[PDB]
Inverse folding.
C-alpha cells in the first residue's frame, strides 16, 4: 500500500478497504489506466459541438482543431478555464463569507459576530474606509460592501489585489494589463475569450490567465480577511493529526470542505452538546477536520486533523466516523456511496453542492445553531447504531504545532526585535542561517504516492536551511509526517535553520524551537504567505521577484491549485508544480509559462515530477535570488 | 461538395480551395475522424489533474471517475460549463454595449448616441426608471447603470429576466429557484459547482444550468435592447445574401463577429470614404456581413450578407475579400492562415480576441471614427495590391427581406388591427391558417451538410402552415436558400400561411406577401422572439408553455447555442437540437432534459439528428400545444 500512500494510517485503512471490498480512489485510478494522452497533454478541445477535437502530440493528422485552433491555442484555452474555475471556487467561498459578515452586522445572523475587531479596523484602513468615530458594525458593513464590490467592474480595480501587493508590484502588473477589474468579471471574460472563435493567440490568452489568477488571489485574501474578522486571526496552537485522532467511544464528526462559516459553528455547538452525547453513551462529540475546513478549525481552535485530500475516504473506513459534515469543494463524491458500507452519515449543507445519496440539511446563517444541532443529532443517532461494533482506528497520530498566521509570525519574531520584527528574519537570510523561504501548497493527487513529493522536497530544503511554510493539504501532508512537531527539529533541520527556530522559540518562552514547518492555514490562507512576502519586499525596498522565496504545489490536483500556482508566478515567485498540468502538448505555451513569463512578472513555473530533482531546482531558484541580492549562497 | 454544403456558392469555393491546396474546415473535420466517443457522449472529465477521466458508455471499466464522479455528474457538469461559457459570450457582448452607451451619454464617445429614443424610454419604463422631467442622457445613464448592475448580486434579481417574462412565468421559475441573481455571479457559480469535489447530483447541477441559461437570456435581451438604443430598432429592409454580393471592382470589406459597436461604425465611415476608394481605382467600399455582426448591419442598414458560420472561409477563397474586420466569437482562427494565401487583410480589434498572424488595430469607442478609417485604409491598400488579379466570385445571391424586429412585426400586424395588433395573428392560429410558430436559431456545424437541416425542417413546417421566424446563422441558412424572398411564398408556404402572409403584406401596401420566413436578427436577437412570445402569452392570459411555439437549433455548434437552447426550454418551449450534445452518455441526464424538465418549466429538448423526423417531432409538439388549448389540429 506504500505505493499508494506513504501515510501508515492510510495504508492500514487501504488493507481494510481491500478485504472488505470497498472501492477507493486508488482503485478507481487503476481502473482508469491508461489515461488519455490527448487530455494529459492538453491536446483536446470540447469547446463546441463540432468537437471533440484532438491533436496528436507527434506524428500525422490531426494536427489542428476543426475551427483552425492550433495546439498552442487549445492548450492555453484549457489552462485559462482551469484558472477561472479555481478563481470561481476561492472567490465563491469569499463571497459567502462577505454575505455572512453583512448579515451578522445587520442583526440577521446572531450566531456570527465581529470577533477580531483589530483585523476589521486594519482591513478597513487598508481599503481606505474611515474608522474614526464609526460604529464597528458600520465599518464591517463597509468592508463587506467593499468585498462584494470587488466581484464586478467599478471605478477602482480589485482592491483585494491592488491594496495587498506593494505599489512597485502593482505597477509591473498594471503595465502588462494584469490587474483584475472584478473577480466574477474576469472569470466570465475567461469563459468568453476561450469559447469557440474568440481569442486565438497563446500569449494573449495566457496574459488573460495571469489576470484571472490575480482574481483568485483576491478571493483567497478576501476569504482569509473575512474569516479572521468573523472567527478570529489564528495564533499558535498545539493539536494532533492523522486517523488516530478518532476515538471509538466518542461521536466522531468530521467537518470537510472549505468554509468556516459552517465548521466554526459545528465546533462550538458540539461542546454545548456534550451532555446529550453522553446521554447517548458517548464520551462526548469529537470534532475532527478534513481538508481546508479542517485546517480552518485546526488553526483557530486546535481541532485535530483526521486526514486530507486523496485519503479522505479512509476516515470512513475506520468504521468510527459517525458523520461527515460537508460544505463544498474537494469532497470526493464517492463518500456518499462508501457511507452505505461504513454507516457514516454524510451530510451536505450548501444548496449548490449536493451529492446523490447524502442527506441534505440546509444550513442558513440565520439559523446556524439550530441547523447545527439538527446535524449533530444525526451524528449522535449514528453513534448509537454502532454501539457494539468493533472499529479499526489506526493508533497513529502526530503532534502538530500550527496557527502561524502572518500576525503570529510577526509577533513571534517581535520577541527578538520589538519594533522591527521582520529584521531578525532578514538578518538570518543575509547571514545564511535561513537560505530562503519555500511555501508548500495544494493537494495530494492519486498519481503521486500520497505525500511523497511534499516530504521528499521538504526534507532536502530543511537540511539546506530553508524556512518552510505550508498551507492546505501540503500542510496536511507535512503535519501527518511530523514536520509540525518541534521534537523533530534536530532530525530535520540544518544547523542554521535550527538555530533560528530555536532562537525564536526560546524568545517565545517555549524552552525549545518553533516547529520545522510553519502551518499558515487553509488554501485561501496562501494569502497569508503573500502578506508575509509582500511585507518582506516592502521592508527590503525590492519587488517580490528579487526575494529568495519560492512555492511548490508538489502534488497538485484541483483547478484551485492551478489558479494558486499561476498567481504565485504572477506575483513574482518561482513556482514548482509536481504533477504534469496539461501543457506538454504545446512547446510554445510551456516556454511561456516556464521561461518567457520571467520577463513579464519575474516569476515562472518549474515543472518537475521527480521530487529530488524538484528540490534541487527549487534550491537553485532560491540561490539565484540570493545571488541577485549580492548574498552568499 | 454537396456532401459538405448545400450552398452552391460554397460548393464552388470548395472546388477552388481544393485545386489551390487551401485547407478548409471540412478538410480539418475529415482529418479529425473518427472523433473521440468519450467526448462525443459527454463521458470525459478534465476538471482536475487526476484526470483525464472517462467512462465507457457500455462494457467494463472505467465506470466512474477517479474522485467518484458518476456518468450523470460528469455529463451534467460538462453541459453546465458549456451553458456558462455561452452566457459569458452573450453577456460579454451586452456588457460592452452597456459601457458604450454610458461613454456616449457622458460625452466620452461622440461617434455614438441615443438613436432610438422611443426604445430608451420604453426600456426605462420596463425597468422602473423614471423618465418624466428627465434628460435623455440621464435616463440612458440610468439604463446603462441598471444593465451593469444585472451582472452582480444586488437587492433585486436580474431585471433583464424578471421584467421581460410575464409574472406567471417568473413565478414558476422562482418557485424552482431558477431566477438568476447576477449574470457573472451565475457564470462563476457554475464554474465553482462543477469543479472537483463540489456539486455531484445531476438534478441539482442541471437546475443550476437552467438558471445560468436565464443569465444568458438576460445578456441576449440586454444586448438587443442596448444595440437598439444606440443603433436603431430594425424595420423591414430589402437586401441580398451569399457570395455574389462581393464585387470585383469594389473594395470588399466583411464585418465579422458579433458586436455592432464596431460594425455599425464601419458602415457609416465606409460611405464617407467612397471618394478615397475611387481614388484607389475601386468603385467604392462594399461592406458585407458575416455571422451575427453581419446580421446586425443587415437588419439595421440592409448591408448584404456574404456568408455565415461554417462556410466563412469561403468568402476569402474568392480572392476578392480585401479585409475581414473582426471583433469576437465564432471566427474560425483558420482565417489568419488562409489570409496568407488569399491576400485578405484580417484585422482584430478587441484586446480579448486576437488571432496569431492577424493585424490588430485597437478599436476604442472614444476614437471609433479614426480607428475605422485606419482599418478601411488597410482594406483600400489591399484592394490596390490585387489590381489585375482575376477573382472568382460565384454569381450566386438571393433576395432577402429582413428587419422583422418585434416592433416591426407588431406594426405590420397593426395594419390589420390597429389597437390590438397581436389579435390577427392569434385569430389565424385559432382558425388554423397558422398552425404555430417555430424559431430557427443557432449555427451551422461541420458534422451536418451545411443548411440541410434548417431547409429540410423549414420546408416541412411551412407546408404545414407554421409561421417561421429565424435568427443568427439559422436566418443565414434560410436567407441563402431563398426563404426570405417573398417571390418564393407560393412555392414554399401552405395555403393558410400564404393567406396570412399575403393579407399582412397587402395591408402593408406591398402588393404581395411578407417573406416565407421572418428574420428577427442576430443571435442576441433571439430575445426579440422571446418578447413576441411573451407578448402573445400575456395577450392570451396563459404561460409560454401553453403556446404552440417551438424552437430548433437545427445545426447547433457554439456553447452560445447550447445556452440559447437551454433557456428556450427554461422559458417553456419544446426545443429541437439537430446535432448531438454531449449528453448521450447519461440516460438519467437525457431523461431530465428531454422529459422530466417538462414538469419543471414545461419546455423540453427534442434531440433528433434526422431532419425529416425532427420536423415531424416539432409538428407533433406544436399540435400537442394546440390540443391543450382546445384547438383543432
Ligand atoms: S472550438 Fe475548435 S478545436 Fe474546440 S471543439 Fe470546437 S472546432 Fe474543435
Ligand atoms: S474531477 Fe473527478 S472525474 Fe474529473 S478529472 Fe478530476 S478525478 Fe476525474
Ligand atoms: S480525446 Fe481524451 S481528453 Fe479528449
Ligand atoms: S477521452 Fe476523448 S474527449 Fe476526453
Amino acid at each position: 500500500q506504500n505505493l499508494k500512500s506513504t501515510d501508515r494510517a492510510v495504508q492500514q485503512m487501504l488493507d481494510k478497504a481491500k478485504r472488505e471490498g470497498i472501492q477507493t480512489v486508488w482503485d478507481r485510478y487503476e481502473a482508469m489506466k491508461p489515461q488519455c494522452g490527448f487530455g494529459e497533454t492538453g491536446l483536446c478541445c470540447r469547446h463546441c459541438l463540432q468537437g471533440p477535437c484532438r491533436i496528436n502530440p507527434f506524428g500525422d493528422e490531426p494536427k489542428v482543431g476543426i475551427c483552425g485552433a492550433t495546439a498552442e491555442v487549445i492548450v492555453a484555452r484549457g489552462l485559462d478555464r482551469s484558472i477561472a474555475a479555481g478563481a470561481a471556487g476561492h472567490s465563491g467561498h469569499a463571497k459567502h463569507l462577505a454575505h455572512t459578515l453583512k448579515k451578522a452586522v445587520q442583526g440577521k445572523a446572531a450566531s456570527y459576530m465581529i470577533k477580531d475587531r483589530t483585523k476589521l479596523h486594519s482591513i478597513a484602513k487598508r481599503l481606505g474606509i474611515p474608522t474614526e468615530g464609526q460604529k464597528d458594525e458600520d465599518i464591517a458593513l463597509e468592508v463587506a460592501k467593499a468585498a462584494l464590490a470587488d466581484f464586478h467592474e467599478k471605478d477602482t480595480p480589485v482592491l483585494w489585489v491592488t491594496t495587498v501587493l506593494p505599489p512597485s508590484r502593482v505597477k509591473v502588473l498594471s503595465a502588462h494589463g494584469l490587474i483584475p477589474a472584478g473577480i466574477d468579471h474576469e472569470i466570465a471574460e475567461i469563459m468568453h475569450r476561450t469559447s469557440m472563435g474568440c481569442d486565438a493567440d497563446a500569449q494573449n490568452l495566457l496574459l488573460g490567465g495571469l489576470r484571472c489568477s490575480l482574481a483568485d488571489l483576491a478571493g483567497c485574501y478576501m476569504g482569509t480577511d473575512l474569516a479572521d474578522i468573523l472567527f478570529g486571526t489564528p495564533a499558535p496552537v498545539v493539536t494532533e493529526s492523522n486517523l488516530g485522532v478518532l476515538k471509538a467511544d466518542a461521536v466522531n464528526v468530521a467537518v470537510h470542505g472549505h468554509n468556516p462559516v459552517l465548521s466554526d459553528i459545528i465546533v462550538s455547538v458540539s461542546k454545548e452538546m456534550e451532555n446529550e452525547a453522553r446521554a447517548a453513551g458517548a464520551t462526548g462529540i469529537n470534532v475532527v477536520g478534513i481538508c481546508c475546513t479542517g485546517n480552518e478549525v485546526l488553526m483557530r481552535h486546535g481541532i485535530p486533523a483526521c486526514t486530507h485530500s486523496v485519503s479522505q475516504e479512509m476516515a470512513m473506513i475506520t468504521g468510527a466516523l459517525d458523520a461527515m459534515i460537508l460544505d463544498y469543494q474537494c469532497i470526493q463524491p464517492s463518500v456518499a456511496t462508501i457511507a452505505e458500507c461504513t454507516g457514516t452519515t454524510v451530510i451536505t449543507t450548501m444548496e449548490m453542492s449536493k451529492i446523490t445519496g447524502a442527506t441534505h440539511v440546509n444550513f442558513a446563517e440565520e439559523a446556524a445553531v439550530e441547523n447545527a444541532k439538527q446535524i449533530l443529532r444525526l451524528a449522535i443517532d449514528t453513534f448509537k447504531r454502532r454501539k457494539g461494533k468493533p472499529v479499526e482506528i489506526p493508533n497513529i497520530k502526530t503532534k502538530v504545532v500550527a496557527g502561524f498566521s502572518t500576525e503570529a509570525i510577526i509577533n513571534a519574531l517581535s520577541k527578538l526585535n520589538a519594533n522591527d520584527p521582520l529584521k531578525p528574519l532578514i538578518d538570518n537570510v543575509v547571514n545564511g542561517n535561513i537560505r530562503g523561504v519555500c511555501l508548500f501548497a495544494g493537494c495530494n493527487n492519486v498519481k503521486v504516492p500520497q505525500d511523497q513529493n511534499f516530504t521528499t522536497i521538504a526534507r532536502k530544503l530543511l537540511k539546506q536551511n530553508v524556512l518552510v511554510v505550508a498551507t492546505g493539504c501540503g500542510a496536511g501532508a507535512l503535519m501527518r509526517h511530523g514536520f509540525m512537531d518541534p521534537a523533530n527539529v534536530d532530525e530535520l533541520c540544518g544547523d542554521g535553520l535550527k538555530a533560528v527556530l530555536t532562537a525564536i522559540g526560546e524568545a517565545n518562552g517555549l524552552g525549545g524551537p518553533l516547529p520545522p514547518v510553519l502551518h499558515m492555514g487553509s488554501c485561501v490562507d496562501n494569502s497569508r504567505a503573500v502578506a508575509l512576502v509582500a511585507a518582506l519586499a516592502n521592508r527590503l525596498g525590492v519587488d517580490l521577484d528579487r526575494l529568495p522565496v519560492v512555492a511548490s504545489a508538489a502534488e497538485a490536483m484541483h483547478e484551485k491549485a492551478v489558479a494558486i500556482g499561476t498567481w504565485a508566478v504572477t506575483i513574482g515567485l518561482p513556482t514548482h508544480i509536481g504533477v504534469l498540468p496539461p501543457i506538454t502538448g504545446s512547446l510554445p505555451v510551456t516556454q511561456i509559462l516556464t521561461s518567457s513569463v520571467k520577463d513579464i512578472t519575474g516569476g515562472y513555473f518549474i515543472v518537475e515530477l521527480d521530487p529530488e530533482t524538484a528540490a534541487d531546482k527549487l534550491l537553485a531558484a532560491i540561490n539565484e535570488r540570493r545571488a541577485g541580492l549580492g548574498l552568499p549562497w
About this structure: The radius of gyration of chain A is 24 Å.
